[PDB]
């Protein structure tokens, strides 16, 4: 089990005509984990700081706000908040 099929679905979504090599897929599959830890780790420490034991969507939001710089946070805060409202109103 890896992200090499779901990242490939994104690759065939934006710029679908181009491909990728097997080595770069080794990088990308690593890269998403580099995004996966530092946001979810710092959010978990956000649960440890202000006397909590629940990680809701508000924790990951300020975790992206604390980690991603500038507009890379300001556009990722509009991507997950759009997705959680679509998930709640299924």
């Amino acid at each position: 089990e890896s992200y090499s099929i779901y990242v490939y679905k994104v690759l065939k979504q934006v710029h679908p005509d181009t491909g990728i090599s097997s080595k770069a897929m080794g990088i990308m599959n690593s890269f998403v984990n580099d995004i996966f830890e530092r946001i979810a780790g710092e959010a978990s420490r956000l649960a440890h700081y202000n006397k909590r034991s629940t990680i809701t969507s508000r924790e990951i939001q300020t975790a992206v706000r604390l980690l991603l710089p500038g507009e890379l946070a300001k556009h990722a805060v509009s991507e997950g908040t759009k997705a959680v409202t679509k998930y709640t109103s299924a």
Binding site: V10, I35, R58, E79, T81, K82, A83
Partner: peptide, 15 residues
């Protein structure tokens, strides 16, 4: 709400 937000943030940055 946490894994949907996290997967959307992953998908946005990979895109």
């Amino acid at each position: 709400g946490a894994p949907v937000y996290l997967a959307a943030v992953l998908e946005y940055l990979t895109a």
